[PDB]
Design an enzyme around this catalytic site. Structure first.
Site, PDB file in Angstrom:
ATOM      1  N   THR C  96      43.066 -23.735 -22.179  1.00  0.00           N
ATOM      2  CA  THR C  96      44.113 -22.883 -22.734  1.00  0.00           C
ATOM      3  C   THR C  96      45.032 -23.667 -23.662  1.00  0.00           C
ATOM      4  O   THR C  96      45.548 -23.112 -24.638  1.00  0.00           O
ATOM      5  CB  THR C  96      44.929 -22.239 -21.612  1.00  0.00           C
ATOM      6  OG1 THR C  96      45.607 -23.257 -20.864  1.00  0.00           O
ATOM      7  CG2 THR C  96      44.028 -21.439 -20.677  1.00  0.00           C
ATOM      8  N   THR C  97      45.251 -24.949 -23.372  1.00  0.00           N
ATOM      9  CA  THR C  97      46.058 -25.808 -24.230  1.00  0.00           C
ATOM     10  C   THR C  97      45.395 -26.117 -25.568  1.00  0.00           C
ATOM     11  O   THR C  97      46.107 -26.399 -26.537  1.00  0.00           O
ATOM     12  CB  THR C  97      46.391 -27.126 -23.508  1.00  0.00           C
ATOM     13  OG1 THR C  97      47.267 -27.911 -24.325  1.00  0.00           O
ATOM     14  CG2 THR C  97      45.129 -27.961 -23.180  1.00  0.00           C
ATOM     15  N   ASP C 402      41.603 -24.312 -11.802  1.00  0.00           N
ATOM     16  CA  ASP C 402      40.896 -24.601 -13.043  1.00  0.00           C
ATOM     17  C   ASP C 402      39.675 -25.480 -12.808  1.00  0.00           C
ATOM     18  O   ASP C 402      38.694 -25.379 -13.552  1.00  0.00           O
ATOM     19  CB  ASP C 402      41.840 -25.275 -14.041  1.00  0.00           C
ATOM     20  CG  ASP C 402      42.997 -24.382 -14.446  1.00  0.00           C
ATOM     21  OD1 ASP C 402      42.795 -23.154 -14.566  1.00  0.00           O
ATOM     22  OD2 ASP C 402      44.112 -24.908 -14.643  1.00  0.00           O
TER      23      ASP C 402
HETATM   24  N1  LIG Z   1      39.444 -39.253 -19.058  1.00  0.00           N
HETATM   25  C1  LIG Z   1      39.443 -38.723 -20.306  1.00  0.00           C
HETATM   26  N2  LIG Z   1      39.160 -39.484 -21.386  1.00  0.00           N
HETATM   27  C2  LIG Z   1      39.153 -38.979 -22.635  1.00  0.00           C
HETATM   28  N3  LIG Z   1      39.425 -37.690 -22.905  1.00  0.00           N
HETATM   29  C3  LIG Z   1      39.727 -36.811 -21.919  1.00  0.00           C
HETATM   30  C4  LIG Z   1      39.753 -37.292 -20.532  1.00  0.00           C
HETATM   31  N4  LIG Z   1      40.074 -36.233 -19.766  1.00  0.00           N
HETATM   32  C5  LIG Z   1      40.242 -35.163 -20.586  1.00  0.00           C
HETATM   33  N5  LIG Z   1      40.034 -35.511 -21.870  1.00  0.00           N
HETATM   34  C6  LIG Z   1      40.128 -34.602 -23.041  1.00  0.00           C
HETATM   35  O1  LIG Z   1      41.182 -33.648 -22.871  1.00  0.00           O
HETATM   36  C7  LIG Z   1      40.786 -32.388 -23.423  1.00  0.00           C
HETATM   37  C8  LIG Z   1      41.408 -31.223 -22.660  1.00  0.00           C
HETATM   38  O2  LIG Z   1      41.565 -31.562 -21.282  1.00  0.00           O
HETATM   39  P1  LIG Z   1      41.842 -30.445 -20.153  1.00  0.00           P
HETATM   40  O3  LIG Z   1      41.318 -30.964 -18.835  1.00  0.00           O
HETATM   41  O4  LIG Z   1      41.407 -29.093 -20.667  1.00  0.00           O
HETATM   42  O5  LIG Z   1      43.450 -30.434 -20.088  1.00  0.00           O
HETATM   43  P2  LIG Z   1      44.239 -29.268 -19.305  1.00  0.00           P
HETATM   44  O6  LIG Z   1      43.749 -29.387 -17.882  1.00  0.00           O
HETATM   45  O7  LIG Z   1      45.693 -29.626 -19.498  1.00  0.00           O
HETATM   46  O8  LIG Z   1      43.817 -27.997 -20.005  1.00  0.00           O
HETATM   47  C9  LIG Z   1      39.264 -32.366 -23.392  1.00  0.00           C
HETATM   48  O9  LIG Z   1      38.748 -31.819 -24.610  1.00  0.00           O
HETATM   49  C10 LIG Z   1      38.838 -33.811 -23.204  1.00  0.00           C
HETATM   50  O10 LIG Z   1      38.088 -34.282 -24.329  1.00  0.00           O
END
Ligand SMILES: Nc1ncnc2c1ncn2[C@@H]1O[C@H](COP(=O)(O)OP(=O)(O)O)[C@@H](O)[C@H]1O
Ligand SMILES: Nc1ncnc2c1ncn2[C@@H]1O[C@H](COP(=O)(O)OP(=O)(O)O)[C@@H](O)[C@H]1O
Ligand SMILES: Nc1ncnc2c1ncn2[C@@H]1O[C@H](COP(=O)(O)OP(=O)(O)O)[C@@H](O)[C@H]1O
Ligand SMILES: [Mg+2]
Ligand SMILES: [Mg+2]
Ligand SMILES: [Mg+2]
Lengths: 191, 548, 546, 520
Positions: C96-97, C402
């Site tokens: 969503t972000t 989520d």
């Molecule tokens: N450990 C990590 N290393 C590099 N990129 C990450 C890592 N964890 C998440 N990301 C990046 O963050 C983006 C969005 O993360 P997400 O889990 O959807 O955040 P939220 O939970 O706040 O929505 C992803 O597209 C991913 O590429």
């Protein structure tokens, strides 16, 4: 200041007995005699209790004389219903009259066909709800779109009776104040 | 129960008065109140420092990266923050160099004192700790000094002096800004080598006149001075050589009226006929003695009459307005003239020497120039500073005042006594003060230790403003001072410092070849006044205010 | 922006009228104004925020799903991004972000194309040909998830959903928890299609030890209190029968509009007795069935509690409708709305009762929970989250909720792709060569579409407080060689991204971060459909309320 | 064209964290002097008007409404610590403030990221639980003499240390009564009753195993002293229950109205005859009682008490073993309670009090506290809640640890030795955890009136020799070992403190923006 008034004001004759062991007898029984007298007045005023299916000659008496009552200004509210069986809202309002009649015995619930009420009445304006009191029309209500329309409920009808001065706000018979026994049971446990 | 008694015996003082004792974490709040504006100074120290917009209630805006200047306009409520304002104001008036440092240090000494007071150190021991650290700090600044100027006038030596000073305020390009100052310093100085005379230099000699338009590359160094004046009678290019003469009069060029009720009196028609011609012949007769001396320009001090102007432009004598005291005094120092208020003959010894007086278009308005030549040099030279934004003219002008203030630092002490810059002078004191804490016993050792930790802000600030990670740049620089027994004897690890732009790791390729240094006289009073700023704030344990 | 326009000059409208590029600029600032709060919450380096309701109550939230829903915006162009955040939470449940940042930058980067006299119809056409070219490239670069013999295709999937949360450090412990939970609550439908109902597991707001020592329940945990205190709390022994009732068990009146009327006063007490007896006859046959544990949706009157206390039956009132279906589904019972059959008689059969191994009531920090474990027919699971307070656990509740949606999609679709902005950087190199092939005005639309996709890896470095261009330039260099890989594996310089904790470019497969490809598909279409909705608006007509 | 009804303006960057960390420091400053044996007391003015005199951390924070939202995360930690254990609430707040105060000059100075600090706290928390497990040891749980000094540890801060000899026996007998066999100690505070009686003397008290009722008998003929009482619990009212169907009676004959009131008397007669089927001697009901039913129970001597609470009936059930039965037909001899005795009604002019005493392992009791004012009765009552709260954990787990700053100092010394051994980017915030445990010893010393700079300096060298049981005395401030005095607490209090302190710091350190104006 309100903490002292809630002991007597927020308890009926059945609820005032809770404070028999805690509060003083003279403080409690003095108010129970007052509330007991008020209950006796409502029983004497309970002259009604079912829908009076009337006809016109009689309207000139039932609807209006009643509205005078004792005429001690003992006024009486008289809810008229110009029924029309072809309309869907009319049959809904007829059910609300019989339901409210079993509860509020002091208020008169009147019903009559709309075709027999007024010469050449508009069928679109039906169902019509009139409220008489001391011979004067307090409210000339139009079809129930104000009260939800087709989705009208018993809670909405009882709320309308409080607005016109027919029933007190803190009455124990109203569904807004008449909390369920299971609701009060949870409050005492969580207190 | 419903309401408190709301502090009884509070009618001893007025309702607006409030007390603020050391308890209730209020000394921590005063440190936090310093931390509000101290972080504003973090983005403003160094060559990569960022200027600040300050919109006053009148609307006059000044853009600046200095502290003493920015703190003048801001109205402050906290008294402990006003100590830093007046401490930096003292720094600007006396030395005119090193004010961001005063704030940065006097603020970090209060920061590390937040840890000391929280540990349980008494306030009396804290002042004794920094004072004993101050005596050792000022002692070691004289020991680790390297290099000296030894010559008042030189083309290459002034590049080592002015360039590291103006590099903080409006860095820009280095050569075009440094040459304007080094050329002007040589004009005003009384060189007089091999005479044994005492040198002399005035801050008010070099003054910058702001003119809009142009670009920074088109700035020139004027021998004389300039105003935005208009000649009254006529303009003259003055292509005639065989230099003109100058006569300065402080009184107006008019008939000396009687101070007490100067009113005409004419008893008969014989006086009526001669009174009109008497004023013409009297004013003309005074101009004969002035005109026969060969003068062609007279600087007036106040309003000049029209009848006196008619006889001045007859012989082609230029008229100049200077309606103020200081504007008239600065011009006499150029030509070296001695004014006399009388309207008589100027003395020949007192007449000044100016070759040419040009009138050209620079900023669209009329200006009068007084450029001298290599022969018969003069002092109190000016610098034509061209720029596009008036706000940038203000900050560059004060950078010349800081550079001119740095030239004052050579006259009073015995010499230059330059130090290594770029954090090298701060990081060296950390090891020396840390060793000093180990030599002294007692509970004051923690005060000596935290005094060294406070000096890390200069390399930490320059690494943060330079867009680099301070966690990697700072400990990489400590390896140059943690080292031992390395080949060369003649050790060159003292010139290691931070770097704003360039190589990775950051220890700079010496501050040497780079030709950036710091002055000893700035560091002495800066650490002295910064410690006094922390002393007066930490020594007080109760604060009382009024009306707010 | 500069000043307000003229109010209905010879137009005669009761409301406001505005036109031209001014409202188009206001939509850009409107999408950027609501996107700035979403910028700092992106990636593991992002920080949380708190929203105050002006009543003391506050809630900590990282994801932009419920943040924008709580932020009451009045500008209608921002409402589409508000609903886009709510839309993406329903279908995918993650990202969503990202759609708010991607949709805002596509409008921001396309704002330069508006004043170039490129029509929006040509701009969206260049975006759409870039979209379907990007989807096919995503369909070429992805990978199935059986993938390898070891699992850890599910342990690594949880780390991506668990990142950027308060419990991201404890994701190593919770990674085994979420995979063991969803593998227990699977079902069967549509003749071989496996489904994974999200929210079927019970997330309890407990307080106590820590998030690290959160014990995974091997079974469902009911969050309700016991009726009476004199009842047995712990019931041991195997084959514990579970009864799931929903009918009204407390004493109730007669039919909704009838009136009781009787002449003979002798039978007045008898009708009172049978009304009290007819409700106890139902409780009599349940005791004959021998149900140790009984659960009821409605209340339980004291007339029924005496029989359960005597026969040692666990009666629990105030159950909810959605819970008892999962109890009956897990324990093997069937939902009983009323006791009857096709015949005229009324009885209760033993087949309606479930089976479980153990039932224990536990209390932890004023939270009574009935722990039902050991379901014989089908397994179940529940997660007891533990933290500081309820408002901190709401972030953990959304973090776990989520995580189930992300692990749901990687099992429904085995294809996955690496994180760290890999596919966002790979599409730029693919679209630049495609932008030159098409020739005419759509080159700038396809090119600026590719430039807007780079904002995802750029925001990871900006929020990290590090140098961003060096990481982007190094990520650009490796992806630039991927298109020119010269196949003959030695197809290297692909499947790389940013490593923010160390600040280097390493392999995301070994690092252990992945994301399903279906999340990338739906996020791109929903982000572009929102971009189409804002670009096509020309003039606003705001009517004041009557 | 605001675009946002809820704080279109924003306070982002580092200034939001200054407001957060400074607010977390302010909540600890108002209770810094509320630690140690020489701790002071506080007064709170609620808007309702009920004053309270408190020193426990949980009662201070819950009655103070705070407008700062970031501070409210600190306000709820004592609420979490209270419901979990009920002891050691003040240490969680100041420890969480020191962790946030020590971690403040790293984003400002070092510019280290918060997520690196989150990893540092977890490894420190993992090592903190490891060394606490090493410092802790087991003891014997059944020794009543040993349990007295452990209950005396938490009591030493409170006002009732002067009656510690009486309070230990008051609480030890109560917690052992409700204790039973079966997490091996499933007893709950809800079963323990504590009735506050203004007046009397705190020295005169006893642990009576019963349920103290606050009302008089309903009829004067009833005997107030029964030798062998028989308790029977009921939920049905002795009054005539009105039907919810709203039944109306059409009376035509003349004898119908007289027969209805005779059936009313016959129903109460038949209902009371079924009570006497098992011939009880004491009846309890949670609803009203008609005057008609009082006369028929005089022949049987069934003492009735009415309008009893639902929780008190359950407490009466566990003591006497009686089963709560609503209807009067299902009374059996097993339903009647037994093994009860010493039923006596002591006459006090304020209110009538009735005692109970015994001769299904669940039991209950009622601690009758005597004092001088209702507010200090709440103080002694809350000390009883703290008196049994420290006793549960030693009974749950046999593990036990020292206290008084010694166990916190052992965490700092062990972390400081391995902090230099780590040699990485996370070692800077890892040192802040070792420095954060120094506030507790320091706080104790400061309150005692000693000089903390030199007392703690020698304490560092003392713990460097290889001992852990060396603490700081609260009265005079020695470095004497706590084995001599006997300051010992459970391990669960210190485990919950470091866990809640670390978990609260992780919540508050990851906040960068503040907004309001939502009005949900
Ligand atoms: N450990 C990590 N290393 C590099 N990129 C990450 C890592 N964890 C998440 N990301 C990046 O963050 C983006 C969005 O993360 P997400 O889990 O959807 O955040 P939220 O939970 O706040 O929505 C992803 O597209 C991913 O590429
Ligand atoms: N180009 C550069 N390289 C390295 N260090 C520099 C450079 N320019 C300035 N510095 C350092 O930054 C410091 C800034 O001093 P500052 O207090 O700003 O001087 P001022 O008093 O003129 O404001 C100087 O002491 C100098 O050592
Ligand atoms: N006389 C004393 N000597 C040394 N330490 C003490 C003394 N009294 C109390 N303490 C310490 O102070 C702490 C106070 O605990 P307690 O008052 O029960 O809760 P809180 O720690 O929240 O105030 C104890 O853990 C104990 O170690
Ligand atoms: Mg300088
Ligand atoms: Mg996610
Ligand atoms: Mg305590």
């Amino acid at each position: 200041a309100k903490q002292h008034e809630n002991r007597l004001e927020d308890k009926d004759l059945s609820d005032l007995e809770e404070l028999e062991d805690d509060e003083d007898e003279d403080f409690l029984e003095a108010y129970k005699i007052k509330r007991l007298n008020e209950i006796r007045k409502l029983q004497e005023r309970s002259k009604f209790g079912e829908v009076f299916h009337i006809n016109k000659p009689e309207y000139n008496k039932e609807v209006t004389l009643a509205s005078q009552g004792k005429k001690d200004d003992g006024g009486v509210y008289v809810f008229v219903h110009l029924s029309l069986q072809s309309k869907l809202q009319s049959r809904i309002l007829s059910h609300l009259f019989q339901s409210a009649a079993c509860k509020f015995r002091e208020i008169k619930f009147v019903e009559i066909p709309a075709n027999r009420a007024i010469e050449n009445y508009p069928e679109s304006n039906c169902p019509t709800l009139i409220v008489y009191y001391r011979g004067e029309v307090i409210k000339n209500m139009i079809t129930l779109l104000e009260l939800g329309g087709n989705n009208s409920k018993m809670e909405d009808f009882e709320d309308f009776m409080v607005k016109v001065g027919a029933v007190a706000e803190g009455d124990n018979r109203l569904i807004m104040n008449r909390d369920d026994e299971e609701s009060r049971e949870e409050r005492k446990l969580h207190y | 129960s419903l309401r408190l008694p709301q502090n009884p015996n509070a009618g001893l003082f007025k309702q607006g008065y409030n007390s603020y004792s050391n308890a209730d974490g209020q000394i921590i709040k005063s440190i936090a109140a310093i931390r509000e504006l101290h972080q504003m100074c973090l983005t403003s120290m160094g060559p990569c420092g960022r200027n600040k917009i300050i919109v006053n209630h009148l609307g006059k805006i000044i853009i600046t990266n200095d502290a003493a200047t920015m703190l003048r306009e801001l109205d402050i409520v906290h008294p402990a923050v006003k100590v830093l304002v007046m401490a930096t104001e003292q720094q600007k008036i006396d030395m005119g160099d090193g004010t961001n440092l005063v704030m940065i240090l006097a603020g970090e000494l209060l920061n590390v004192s937040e840890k000391l007071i929280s540990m349980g150190l008494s306030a009396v021991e804290i002042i004794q700790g920094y004072n004993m650290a101050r005596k050792f700090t000022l002692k070691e600044l004289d020991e680790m000094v390297v290099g000296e100027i030894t010559d008042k006038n030189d083309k290459n030596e002034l590049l080592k002096m002015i360039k590291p000073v103006i590099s903080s305020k409006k860095y820009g390009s280095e050569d075009i800004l440094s040459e304007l100052v080094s050329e002007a310093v040589s004009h005003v100085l009384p060189v007089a080598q091999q005479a044994g005379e005492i040198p002399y230099f005035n801050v008010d000699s070099i003054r910058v006149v702001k003119i809009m338009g142009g670009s920074l590359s088109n700035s020139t160094v004027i021998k004389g001075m300039v105003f935005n004046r208009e000649p009254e009678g006529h303009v003259k290019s003055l292509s005639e050589d065989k230099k003109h003469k100058v006569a300065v009069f402080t009184c107006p060029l008019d008939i000396a009226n009687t101070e007490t009720k100067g009113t005409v009196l004419l008893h008969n028609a014989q006086e009526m006929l001669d009174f009109s011609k008497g004023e013409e012949k009297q004013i003309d007769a005074m101009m004969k003695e002035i005109a026969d001396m060969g003068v062609e320009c007279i600087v007036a001090g106040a309003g000049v009459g029209e009848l006196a102007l008619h006889y001045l432009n007859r012989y082609g004598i230029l008229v100049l307005k200077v309606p103020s005291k200081f504007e008239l005094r600065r011009l006499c120092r150029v030509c070296g003239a001695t004014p006399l208020p009388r309207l008589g003959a100027p003395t020949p010894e007192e007449l000044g020497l100016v070759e040419t007086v040009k009138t050209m278009e620079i900023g669209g308005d009329r200006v009068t120039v007084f450029k001298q030549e290599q022969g018969e040099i003069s002092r109190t030279s000016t610098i034509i500073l061209r720029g596009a934004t008036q706000n940038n003219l203000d900050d560059i002008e004060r950078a010349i005042d800081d550079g001119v203030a740095a030239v004052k630092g050579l006259m009073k002490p015995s010499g230059g006594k330059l130090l290594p810059g770029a954090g090298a002078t701060e990081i060296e004191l950390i090891s020396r003060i840390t060793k000093y804490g180990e030599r002294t016993p007692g509970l004051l050792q923690l005060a000596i230790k935290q005094f060294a930790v406070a000096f890390e802000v200069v390399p930490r600030t320059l690494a943060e403003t330079a867009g680099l990670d301070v966690n990697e740049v700072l400990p990489n620089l400590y390896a140059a001072h943690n080292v031992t027994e390395p080949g060369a004897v003649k050790t060159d690890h003292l010139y290691k410092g931070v770097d704003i732009d360039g190589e990775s790791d950051e220890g700079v390729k010496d501050i040497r070849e780079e030709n950036i240094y710091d002055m000893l006289a700035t560091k002495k009073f800066a650490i002295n006044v910064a410690t006094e700023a922390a002393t007066t704030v930490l020594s007080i344990d109760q604060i009382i205010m009024a009306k707010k | 922006q500069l000043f307000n326009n003229s109010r209905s000059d010879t137009l005669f409208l009761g409301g406001e009228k505005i036109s031209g590029d001014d409202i188009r600029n206001q939509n850009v600032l409107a999408t950027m104004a609501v996107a700035n709060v979403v910028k700092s919450s992106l990636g593991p380096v992002g920080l949380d925020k708190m929203l105050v309701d002006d009543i003391g109550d506050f809630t900590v939230t990282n994801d932009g799903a419920t943040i924008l829903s709580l932020l009451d915006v009045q500008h209608p162009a921002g409402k589409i991004l508000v609903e886009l955040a709510q839309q993406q939470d329903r279908e995918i449940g993650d990202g969503t972000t990202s759609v708010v940042i991607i949709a805002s930058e596509l409008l921001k980067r396309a704002n330069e194309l508006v004043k170039n006299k490129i029509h929006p119809t040509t701009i969206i056409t260049g975006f759409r040909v870039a979209l379907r070219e990007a989807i096919r490239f995503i369909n070429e670069v992805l990978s199935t998830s059986v993938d390898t013999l070891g699992k850890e295709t599910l342990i690594n999937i949880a780390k991506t959903s668990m990142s950027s949360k308060i419990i991201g450090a404890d994701s190593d412990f919770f990674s085994n928890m979420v995979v063991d939970a969803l593998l227990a609550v699977k079902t069967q439908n549509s003749k071989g299609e496996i489904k994974y109902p999200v929210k079927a597991v019970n997330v309890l707001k407990a307080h106590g030890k820590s998030a690290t020592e959160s014990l995974l329940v091997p079974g469902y945990a009911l969050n309700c209190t016991v009726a009476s205190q004199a009842m047995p709390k712990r019931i041991a022994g195997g084959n514990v029968k579970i009864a799931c009732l929903d009918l009204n068990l407390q004493k109730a009146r007669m039919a909704m509009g009838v009136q009781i009327n009787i002449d003979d006063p002798e039978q007045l007490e008898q009708i009172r007795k049978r009304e009290a007896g007819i409700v106890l006859e139902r409780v009599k046959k349940i005791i004959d069935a021998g149900a140790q544990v009984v659960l009821t949706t409605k209340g339980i009157d004291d007339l029924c509690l005496k029989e359960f206390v005597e026969a040692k039956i666990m009666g629990v009132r105030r159950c909810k409708k959605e819970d008892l279906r999962r109890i009956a589904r897990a324990t093997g019972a069937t939902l009983v709305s009323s006791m009857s059959n096709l015949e005229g008689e009324e009885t209760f059969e033993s087949s309606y009762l479930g089976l479980c191994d153990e039932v224990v009531q536990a209390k932890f920090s004023d939270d009574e929970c009935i722990l039902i474990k050991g379901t014989s027919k089908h397994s179940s699971s529940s997660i007891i989250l533990r933290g500081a307070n309820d408002y901190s656990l709401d972030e953990m509740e959304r973090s776990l909720h989520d995580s189930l949606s992300v692990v749901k999609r990687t099992l429904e679709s085995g294809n996955v792709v690496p994180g760290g902005g890999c596919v966002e950087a790979a599409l730029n190199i693919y679209l630049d060569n495609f932008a030159t092939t098409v020739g005419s005005r759509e080159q700038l639309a396809i090119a600026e579409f590719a430039a807007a996709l780079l904002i995802i890896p750029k925001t990871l470095a900006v929020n990290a407080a590090k140098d961003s261009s060096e990481l982007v330039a190094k990520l650009r260099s490796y992806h630039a060689a991927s298109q020119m890989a010269k196949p003959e594996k030695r197809r290297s310089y692909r499947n790389y991204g940013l490593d923010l904790i160390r600040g280097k470019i390493v392999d995301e497969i070994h690092a252990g971060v992945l994301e399903p490809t279906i999340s990338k598909v739906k996020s791109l279409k929903s982000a572009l459909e929102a971009c189409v909705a804002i670009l096509r608006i020309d003039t606003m007509i705001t009517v004041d309320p009557e | 064209v605001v675009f946002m009804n809820a704080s279109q303006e924003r306070t982002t960057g580092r200034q939001a964290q200054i407001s957060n960390i400074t607010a977390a420091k302010a909540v600890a400053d108002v209770i810094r002097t509320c630690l140690g044996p020489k701790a002071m007391l506080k007064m709170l003015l609620d808007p309702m008007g009920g004053l309270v005199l408190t020193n426990d951390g949980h009662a201070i924070l819950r009655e103070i409404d705070v407008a700062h939202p970031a501070a409210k995360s600190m306000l709820e930690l004592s609420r979490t610590q209270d419901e979990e254990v009920g002891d050691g609430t003040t240490t969680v707040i100041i420890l969480a403030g020191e962790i946030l105060a020590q971690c403040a000059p790293y984003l400002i100075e070092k510019n280290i990221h918060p997520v690196i600090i989150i990893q540092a706290l977890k490894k420190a928390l993992t090592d903190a639980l490891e060394v606490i497990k090493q410092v802790s040891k087991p003891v014997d749980v059944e020794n009543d003499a040993a349990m007295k000094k452990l209950i005396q540890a938490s009591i030493g801060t409170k006002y009732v240390i002067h009656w510690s000899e009486k309070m230990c026996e008051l609480a030890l007998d109560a917690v052992k009564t409700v204790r039973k066999d079966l997490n091996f100690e499933i007893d709950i505070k809800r079963y323990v009753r504590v009735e506050k009686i203004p007046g009397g003397d705190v020295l005169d008290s006893r642990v009576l195993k019963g349920v103290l009722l606050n009302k008089d008998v309903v009829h004067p003929k009833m005997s107030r002293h029964i030798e062998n009482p028989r308790v029977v619990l009921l939920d049905c009212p002795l009054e005539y229950k009105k039907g919810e169907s709203q039944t109306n009676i059409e009376i035509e004959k003349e004898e119908d109205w007289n027969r209805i009131l005779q059936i009313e008397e016959e129903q109460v007669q038949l209902m009371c005859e079924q009570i006497l089927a098992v011939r009880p001697t004491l009846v309890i009901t949670e609803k009203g009682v008609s005057d008609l039913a009082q006369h028929y129970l005089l022949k049987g001597g069934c003492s009735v008490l009415r309008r009893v609470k639902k929780s008190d009936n359950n407490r009466i059930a566990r003591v006497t073993g009686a089963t709560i039965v609503n209807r009067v037909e299902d009374l059996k001899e097993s339903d009647v309670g037994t093994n009860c005795g010493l039923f006596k009604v002591e006459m006090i002019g304020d209110e009538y009090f009735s005692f109970l005493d015994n001769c299904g392992l669940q039991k209950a009791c009622t601690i009758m506290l005597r004092g001088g004012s209702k507010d200090i009765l709440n103080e002694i009552d809350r000390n009883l809640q703290d008196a049994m709260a420290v006793a549960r954990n030693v009974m749950l787990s046999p593990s036990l640890s020292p206290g008084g700053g010694a166990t916190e100092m052992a965490v700092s010394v062990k972390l400081a030795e391995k902090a230099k051994q780590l040699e990485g980017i996370q070692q800077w915030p890892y040192q802040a955890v070792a420095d954060a445990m120094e506030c507790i010893p320091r706080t104790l010393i400061q309150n005692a009136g000693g000089d903390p700079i030199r007392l703690l300096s020698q304490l560092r060298a003392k713990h460097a020799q290889g001992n852990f049981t060396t603490g700081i005395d609260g009265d005079k401030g020695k470095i004497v070992d706590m084995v001599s005095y006997g300051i010992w607490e459970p391990e669960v209090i210190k485990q919950q403190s470091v866990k809640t302190a670390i978990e609260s710091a992780c919540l508050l350190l990851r906040v960068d923006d503040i907004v309001s104006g939502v009005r949900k």
